[PDB]
Each structure stands twice: as C-alpha cells, then as structure tokens.
Amino acid sequence: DRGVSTFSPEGRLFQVEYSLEAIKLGSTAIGIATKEGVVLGVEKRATSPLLESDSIEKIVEIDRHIGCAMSGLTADARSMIEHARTAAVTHNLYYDEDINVESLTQSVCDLALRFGELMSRPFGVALLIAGHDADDGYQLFHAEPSGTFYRYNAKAIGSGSEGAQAELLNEWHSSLTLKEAELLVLKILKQVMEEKLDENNAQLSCITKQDGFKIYDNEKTAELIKELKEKEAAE
C-alpha cells in the first residue's frame, strides 16, 4: 500500500483529494449571506420512504450566533460539531463574550489535518458555517477537510454543487433581502435535487443578529415553497 500523509507528484495530499470525492457524493447544502441575515438550506435525501425524515439532522446549532450545515460522510461531522460547540462555550467562559465566526471556523479547520501515522484519515465531510458577530457582521464560511476555509457571499456543496454555484453567481447581489435569499435557496435546491422538493425532504434555517440561529419548521418552509412556485408562474 502507501502512506496516509503522502504527496502526489502534482503536489497534493492523496487522502485529502480522495475525501473531496466523498463530499461530491453527499447531499446538497446551500448557504446565502445578506445584510439582513445568513440563510442555510439542505437536501435531506432519505434512502427509503419508511425512514422518518425529521430525524435527518444535517443543519446544526453551534452557538446562538453560529449555525452549521454539512455534506458528505455526515457521521464524521459529529466530533467536528462537538469541538466547535466546546470551542464556542469555552471562549465565552474565558472572555465573557461571543466568539468571532472566523475564529470558530479556524478552530474547526485545525482538526482537519490532524491525521496520519491523531486520527487515521481526514474527515469525509464539508461544512458550511454561518454566523454573525459585532465586528465583521453576517458571514458564511466553507470549511473543507484540507484545513482551508473561504468566506463566501453564497456557496453550494454536495452533488449538485457546480450547477448550483453557477446559478448563485447570476442571482446574488449585495442588496438581497432575507426573504429573497430564502426563496433563492429553495429555488436552487429544487433545480439540483433528484426527487421533487417539499417540506419533508428539504430543510431551511437562518441566523439573524436579533433572534440568533433558528431551524425553520416544516410548516414555515412549506409556505415559502408555495410562495416560490406562485412567483415563478407569475411571469
């Protein structure tokens, strides 16, 4: 065989590149950042109709001001979330304040490359970390198993990502309202999803300064789905 921390001839880590292929097989997750808030949405993708879809937890709270959506080998994300939650609460204990979104992301990304021959392999999951702080305002971050993170105005990850990212390129502007962003995530999710989009196989969430991180109810999302379909038929 061959080493876990080996470089390829092109100058990339084999295991990191292979984990990126696992993330492409994962279900779609989209995030959009505005001046009124950051929206996070995911494809649930139940493997069978008997599976109770509300138990699929692919959007997750880290703190009141920071939320998280995932894509790939979602079991691997559990220890990453646990670390993020502990980092957020621990900082609040040491400094009597909320922790910066960027600093939280950086702490999660420090786990990523702690593998070799520490854990035996990289994580097989990508994260969209969305939040708000007083300094830099509403923020969206994409955290990879390479240990790298980019800030984004909008970002898609998972199986329909390259198609959804091209769509987000055209649609995003700096004056988007929160309501506009909610519909835009639902619109783009419906395009790239295999099965037909509804309240049971897709989930929305957001983070605002005032109300913090909130996962939307199936009743609330259903009305936004209905509002979206009417607006597309209206022209």
Partner 1 sequence: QFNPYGDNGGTILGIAGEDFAVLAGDTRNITDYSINSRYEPKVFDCGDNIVMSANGFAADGDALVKRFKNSVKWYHFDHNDKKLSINSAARNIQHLLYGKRFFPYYVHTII
Partner 2 sequence: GYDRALSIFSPDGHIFQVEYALEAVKRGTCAVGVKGKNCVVLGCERRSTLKLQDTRITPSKVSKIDSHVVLSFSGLNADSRILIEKARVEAQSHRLTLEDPVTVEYLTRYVAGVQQRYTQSGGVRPFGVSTLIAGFDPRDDEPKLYQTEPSGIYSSWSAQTIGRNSKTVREFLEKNYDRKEPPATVEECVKLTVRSLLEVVQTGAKNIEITVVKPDSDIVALSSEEINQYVTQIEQEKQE
Partner 3 sequence: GSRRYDSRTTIFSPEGRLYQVEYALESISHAGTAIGIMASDGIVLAAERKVTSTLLEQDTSTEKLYKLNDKIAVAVAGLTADAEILINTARIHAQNYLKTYNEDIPVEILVRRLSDIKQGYTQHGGLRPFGVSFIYAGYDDRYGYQLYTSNPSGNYTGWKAISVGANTSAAQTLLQMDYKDDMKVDDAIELALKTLSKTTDSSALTYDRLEFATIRKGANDGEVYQKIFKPQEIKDILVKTGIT
Site residues (vs partner 1, CB under 8 A): 93-97, 100, 102-103, 135-136
Contacting partner 2 within 47-66 (CB under 8 A) = 48-52, 54-56
Give the 3-state secondary structure of residue 156: strand
- x/- map, 99-128, partner 3, by CB under 8 A: ------------------x-----------
Cα Rg of the chain (Å, integer): 18
Question: Contacts with partner 2: how many residues (CB under 8 A)?
Answer: 34
4 sits near partner 2 (criterion: CB under 8 A): yes
Among 27-35, 122-130, 156-164, 169-177, which window interacts with partner 2 (CB under 8 A)? 122-130
Per partner kind, with CB cut-offs from 5 to 8 A, the member of partner 3, partner 1, partner 2, none near residue 102 is partner 1
2 sits near partner 3 (criterion: CB under 8 A): yes
Shortest distance, CB of residue 2 to partner 3, whole angstroms? 8
Q: Can you tell me which residue has the tokens 């989209």? A: 30
Per partner kind, with CB cut-offs from 5 to 8 A, the member of partner 3, partner 2, partner 1, none near residue 55 is partner 2
DSSP H or E run through 141: strand 137-143
Rounded-to-integer distance, Cα 1 and Cα 194, Å: 37
Contact present, 71 and 172 (Cβ < 8 Å): no
The full DSSP string for 65-86 is TEEEEEEESGGGHHHHHHHHHH
Q: Which is nearer to partner 2, 111 or 156 (CB)?
A: 111
DSSP H or E run through 126: strand 125-133
